[PDB]
Design a protein around this ligand. Structure first.
Ligand code: IUM
Ligand code: IUM
Ligand code: IUM
Ligand code: IUM
Lengths: 531, 531
């Protein structure tokens, strides 16, 4: 009865939400898994037992236990990413926005949030699917997955904490969407999983995981890809970090059973408190509990998989932001402050490049510095600052994504590559951080469309193009409307390597995104480090 | 009696030569050493026994046995460097051009010719000191030194063929100049040794050799420096190449005495014929018999010496040509022909970079290619062609010279650095080779001044500036006339690193010649190869 949806798990009662002019149906906090609490912490998600009665899908679910950024308390720029609902280990819930009237079988977009696998909520203001569902008439799903140690602790042997359990959370949401989105008017045969940062890395990992390929049609990857250096550890390093996490909580680490038991008794916040102490390196843009290359979720190494074509072959739309690195530099690298044009000294640059590339020897750090220093001007604080952003952005998202694009396009049924380089007019972060990691999201979710948000008209325009690019790609596997007034977004071929700018200036097409630098990061530096 | 000069070695009768308007005295083929023939092949030069009677110093001496370029027979571009007098092992002679009337004590410039230590003559048209002596009123000396195996065969143990013997030839000419230039009107207290290519490398080596520092005042180094990768071998490699030279002539190489004896019986041309077979590498811009870092001439390694300040501390004027590499690419690297715009394929580029950097492993070759490829355009034949020239020019002359400038300026009494980037209007070589190795020489020696040579007026202008820069530097240790209408040639400091363009456009000052690339060649690639 519009808001009464009767699903294979039970009846779900949603709520009308106002969006722009109209209203839309919203179903919020649908459980898709049994609460991963108690003896079930670190365990694989268990499918949600069906409920008697109607489920009140009208309020946002608990967010999952996660690190809370208090680096800039009150600063909307950082709080916009913080959990906005009560945190709870009970948090495996998804959110669905459906048009009014209910479509019959229309496209589904399943948003998977980023947050470096230690943070993230489906429920943040910038992930509100109102605007996207309304504007583009897509059923929009937000999912939830366990982040941090709760989702990615990996004692590879044990059944009680294998890794990737937070990815399995995602996969179960995807199963539920596959099984039940039809009752919300969604077409399970065309669900598109999009995500940003670790969310896009996750999307890439379901393209890769055999166990996930059947559960979605298409994929959008924003500023992340499965092969990103921060997105996976070996099972050995996962074990190492799991044990070190237990060492921090004074766990008896005689056996996996002993460790897991200890970690299961700790309050969620104590895991969170010591979580960053288990990194093996003084480092930027590294997270403690990330997916493990474990043999089950990933059959082998991601590189083999990308090489063999061992991945779901579909269409992907993906891309990066211009200044991917600045966010992590501000937070982690000396000399970058929020309130200064963060001109970076030479001493702080070398501190920064050493933090950015923690796995690199003195030779590798020299290679990086050679690549990224303006040697005509090696003490220019701006060039050092921007160069650090470039190092961090190229090493950590742009070049791994371009590696992934190249390897994937060899076997996929279509690749669209954007380069988002628009600084929002109302961006609350300093100018020096540029087009920041994560700040294409508000444009994907249509926030320039709400006038109270103080976007320019030109930005609202861009948001409508992006949403239209995104939903058209989701519907059709091509972001372009067939024969439209807009100019066409070229396919990315391994031949021409074309890609588009996304900003308010009209579309420009380019070749070979950061190729000079990505040849360094993808081809040369690894060869150098192995030698 | 103008042309009758009575020297410590005996009387010398020269000849009036017409130069531009006037005439000048010329003394040609003064012997400064005993003919290094017979049992004296490969031996240290022996000082010339004084002669009875007058020495006819009116014709050019024999040139020294050397490889003769027949790659482009008749092509003036290549024949201008070939021996133009009868070749002979008897060839240790110097040439003096004196003004008319005879000055009393005026500056001396001692030209040391290049030719990669395997070739060179004092007597080539482009080394005619008429124009420089006339125009700038300097006594101008050309010397001769044994090149190739005859000057640089190095069986380190033996007294009968230690290396560097061709450098000792140079040092003896310098002694003779020190002892006798006064009788030609020259001031031994201010002789300036200049040289180009291996000639400038040689000049650098007398700055370094304790045994030579006292014999000259100032130094000009054109497109060469003692630390150039092609300018010295270890004594071990010298022995290796000496033995391999003997292996090619079917010498009994049981003992040094046996080898040297065999090499002493061979006709000069048989040494020359097999000379290039002893290189250890398929290589460009490597010569077989070069100076040996032997403990006597050089006390230790050149790098230690440059580091410790263990060198003659004076003023040096030095610099490089823009397109230093093209000459060797045309001759040695596949895909470069004289008569085509030598657009270089990718297969021929990698062949070229492998030839340019023969001592480098696959990792180093990758590093070079990373540095020098336009990855937006890696198949552009022009960019590949020019890039090869840059690789060869940077690796082989520009970056070692900049290393030498930097190390030297720490301790020297003044450094002037030019960058010659003028392509002669009448250059007979193809356009693609650019400002070619060696083609600033005609400007230093004032050939744009003879109208029959078809230089532009603007080029004659440049030649007069260069000659004036050169002789003023020789006279004064500063190329600048004190308070003149010309703009001042900045000192090269390690602080600002300033240097001037030399061309017909008016002087421009720049910083940090090819620093991005020289940081690669001087700092990074060696660190990479040692690892
Ligand atoms: O709680 U237990 O292996
Ligand atoms: O990292 U930025 O132009
Ligand atoms: O001719 U003998 O040692
Ligand atoms: O070797 U050049 O421009």
């Amino acid at each position: 009865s519009e808001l009464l949806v009767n699903t294979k798990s039970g009846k779900v009662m949603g709520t009308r939400v106002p969006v722009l002019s109209s209203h839309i149906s919203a179903f919020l906090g649908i459980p898709f898994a049994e609460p991963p609490v108690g003896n079930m912490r670190f365990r694989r998600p268990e499918p949600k037992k069906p409920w008697s009665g109607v489920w009140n899908a009208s309020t946002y679910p608990n967010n999952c236990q996660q690190y809370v950024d208090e680096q800039f308390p009150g600063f909307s720029g950082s709080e916009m990413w913080n959990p906005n609902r009560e945190m709870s280990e009970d948090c495996l819930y998804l959110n669905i926005w459906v048009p009014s009237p209910r479509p019959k079988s229309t496209t589904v977009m399943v948003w998977i949030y980023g947050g470096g696998f230690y943070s993230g909520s489906s429920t943040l203001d910038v992930y509100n699917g109102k605007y996207l569902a309304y504007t583009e008439e897509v059923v929009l799903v937000s999912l939830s997955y366990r982040v941090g140690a709760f989702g990615f602790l990996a004692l590879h042997g044990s059944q009680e904490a294998p890794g990737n359990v937070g990815l399995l959370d995602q996969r179960m949401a995807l199963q539920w969407v596959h099984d039940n989105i039809q009752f919300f008017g969604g077409d399970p045969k065309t669900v598109t999983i999009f995500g940003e940062s670790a969310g896009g890395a996750s999307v890439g990992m379901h393209i890769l995981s055999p166990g996930s390929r059947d559960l979605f049609r298409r994929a959008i990857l924003q500023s992340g890809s499965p092969n990103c250096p921060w997105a996976s550890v070996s099972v050995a390093e996962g074990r190492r970090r799991a044990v070190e996490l237990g060492r921090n909580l004074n766990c008896n680490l005689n056996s996996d059973e002993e460790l897991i038991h200890c970690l299961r008794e700790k309050k969620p916040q104590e895991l969170i408190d010591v979580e960053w102490n288990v990194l093996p390196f003084d480092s930027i843009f590294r997270f403690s509990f990330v997916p493990v290359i474990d043999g089950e979720f990933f059959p082998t190494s991601l590189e083999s998989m990308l090489n063999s074509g061992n991945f779901k072959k579909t269409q992907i739309l993906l891309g990066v932001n211009k200044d991917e690195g600045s966010f992590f530099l501000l937070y982690g690298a000396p000399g970058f402050s929020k309130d200064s044009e963060s001109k970076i000294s030479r001493e702080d640059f070398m501190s920064g490049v050493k933090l950015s590339v923690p796995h690199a020897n003195d030779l590798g750090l020299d290679a990086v510095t050679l690549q990224y220093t303006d040697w005509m001007d090696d003490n220019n604080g701006i060039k050092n600052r921007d160069g650090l952003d470039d190092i961090v952005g190229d090493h950590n998202v742009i070049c791994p994504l371009m590696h992934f694009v190249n390897k994937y396009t060899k076997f996929g049924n279509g690749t669209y590559l954007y380069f988002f380089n628009h600084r929002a007019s109302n961006l609350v972060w300093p100018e020096w951080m540029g087009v920041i990691h994560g700040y294409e999201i508000e444009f994907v979710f249509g926030l320039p469309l709400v006038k109270e948000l103080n976007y320019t008209a030109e930005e609202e325009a861009l948001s409508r193009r992006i949403m239209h690019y995104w939903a058209t790609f989701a519907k059709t596997g091509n972001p372009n409307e067939p024969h439209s007034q807009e100019s066409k977004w070229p396919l990315f071929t391994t031949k021409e390597q074309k890609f588009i700018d996304l900003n308010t200036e009209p579309m420009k097409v380019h070749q070979r995104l950061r190729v000079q630098m990505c040849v360094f990061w993808n081809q040369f530096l690894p060869k150098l480090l192995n030698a």
